[PDB]
Amino acid sequence: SRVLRVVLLGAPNAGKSTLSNQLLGRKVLGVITEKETQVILLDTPGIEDPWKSMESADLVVVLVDVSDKWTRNQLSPQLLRCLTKYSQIPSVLVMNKVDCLKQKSVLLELTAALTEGVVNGKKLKMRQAFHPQRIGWPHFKEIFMLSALSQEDVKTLKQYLLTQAQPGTPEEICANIIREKLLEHLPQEVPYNVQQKTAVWEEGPGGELVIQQKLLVPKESYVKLLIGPKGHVISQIAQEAGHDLMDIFLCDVDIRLSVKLLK
Amino acid sequence: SRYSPEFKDPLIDKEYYRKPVEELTEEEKYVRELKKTQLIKAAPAGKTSSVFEDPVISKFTNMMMIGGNKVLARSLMIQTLEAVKRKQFEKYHAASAEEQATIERNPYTIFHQALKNCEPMIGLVPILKGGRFYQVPVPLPDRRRRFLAMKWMITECRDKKHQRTLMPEKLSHKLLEAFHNQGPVIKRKHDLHKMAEANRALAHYRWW
C-alpha cells in the first residue's frame, strides 16, 4: 500500500478543479485508488486554506495558465512565499491550457522563466546564434505541459503521480447536475442566481425516477434566458441533465424543469 | 522524376503471390484486383527474389559506398562477413565442450545482433525560438535508430587512428565487440542515453 498527498495550487482560473475532475475520472478532497497506490488530491482556492492544505502535502502541483499573457510570465509573490516556506516538499510545474496557444514554441521560453533555468537540480546549457522579487522557482522536480479541457497529457501526470507514491443525497446529486448544466448554458451571473427546489421525486409506474424541479430566479430577464428561444435552452438542459442522471442512478429518469419568479 | 505519378513501386516478394486465393481476405483481394489496373515501376538494380537477400546488409553496403563504387562496397561487405565467420570458427574449435554451445557461427545473426545492440532509443532534436536552438529529448523512430546504429559503426571504422588496418578487419572486430555489448559504439549509445538523461527538463515537449 503506497500513499501520496498532492496539493494543487495555482491562480483562481488556472483550472485546478478541472484537472481534479479529469484526474479523478468524475466531475466532483478527492481519492484515487489504483492497484496498491492511493493518491489524495487537495484542491485549494486560488490566491489560509492553501497554507493549511500544504501543511499536509507530500507533493505540490503548481499550475500556470499559459493562455493568460498577464500571469503566464511569472509566479505570484504569495505563491513564491508559499513554496519558500515549504521548500522541503517536492514541487512539480503544470502548464495548463496549452491548446489555447497559437505558437507552442512559446512554452519553451516560459519554462526558462518559470523554472529559473534549473529543474530537479540540473542546469540547462544553451548557446545562441553568433556569440529582488523572484519571478520563477528553481526547485521544480518535473514539468508537464497539458490541457485540462481536452484531457491532453493528463494521463501522463496521473502515471507520474502514481509512481511518486511513497511508503505508507440523490437530491443533492440532481441539484448539482442541474447546476452544472445551468453554468454551462447560461451567461454571466445568471446561473449563480438560480435557486433549485424539488417538487416531485418518486418512482413511476414503470420503475423510472420521476423528478420535477422548480428553478426560481429573482428577475424576469433570468426567466427569459432560462427558457430561451421557444423553450430550447431549458429543454436542452433538462435533456442533458436526465442523461447524466440516467448514468448516475442506472435507471430511467423522467426529469421536468419549471421556471418561476421569486416573489 | 521520369516516372509519372500513377506509377507504383513494385513488390518483389515472391511468397506473397503464392498465397492461395482462399486465404485472401476481402480487403487483400480488393488490393490484388486494384494492382492489375496500375502501372508498376521497373524493379531497380539491387533487391531480388533471392532467398539470401538481406535488406539490412544491402543498406549497410549502400552506406559504405564512396562515389558510386558498389562493387568495392559489396566486396568489403562479403570480406567482413567471411572474416567474422572464420574468427568464430577459430574460437569454436579452440573451445571446450560446454562453451561450444554458446558460440555463434552464423555471421548474419552476429551482424543483426551487433546492430541491434547499438540502436539508441532516445535522442535530442533541436527546436528554434528566441535565437536559442532548444535541445529537447525525443523518442527516436525505429528507422532513425536503425540508421544511427549503422552510421556510428561506419564512422567508428573510418577513424584515422586505425592506421593501415584494412576495413574488413576493423569492421569484423567492431561487429564482434558490439555482439558482446562492448566497444566504442556501445559507449556512443550510452553517452547519448546519459546525456539525454542530463536534459530531462524539456522531456515532455511532444510536438517536435
UniProtKB/Swiss-Prot annotation, chain A:
GO cellular component: cytosol; mitochondrial inner membrane; mitochondrial matrix; mitochondrion
Source taxonomy: Eukaryota, Metazoa, Chordata, Craniata, Vertebrata
Name this polypeptide is given: GTPase Era, mitochondrial
Positions of the UniProt region annotated as G1: 10-17
KH type-2 domain mapped to chain residues: 186-263
Region (G3): 43-46
Positions of region (G4): 96-99
Span of the entire protein shown here: 111 to 437 of 437
Domain Era-type G, residue spans: 2-168
One of the GO BP terms on file: ribosomal small subunit assembly
Swiss-Prot record, chain B:
GO cellular component: mitochondrial inner membrane; mitochondrial small ribosomal subunit; mitochondrion; ribosome
UniProt entry keywords in alphabetical sequence: Acetylation, Disease variant, Mitochondrion, Primary mitochondrial disease, Ribonucleoprotein, Ribosomal protein, Transit peptide
The keyword Transit peptide appears for this protein: yes
Pfam assignment, any one: Ribosomal_S7
A GO MF label: mRNA binding
Record SUPFAM superfamilies: Ribosomal protein S7 (SSF47973)
UniProt subcellular location: Mitochondrion
Source organism superkingdom: Eukaryota
PTM sites of type N6-acetyllysine: K174, K194
Similarity comment text for this entry: Belongs to the universal ribosomal protein uS7 family.
Protein name per the record: Small ribosomal subunit protein uS7m
Gene transcribed to yield this protein: MRPS7
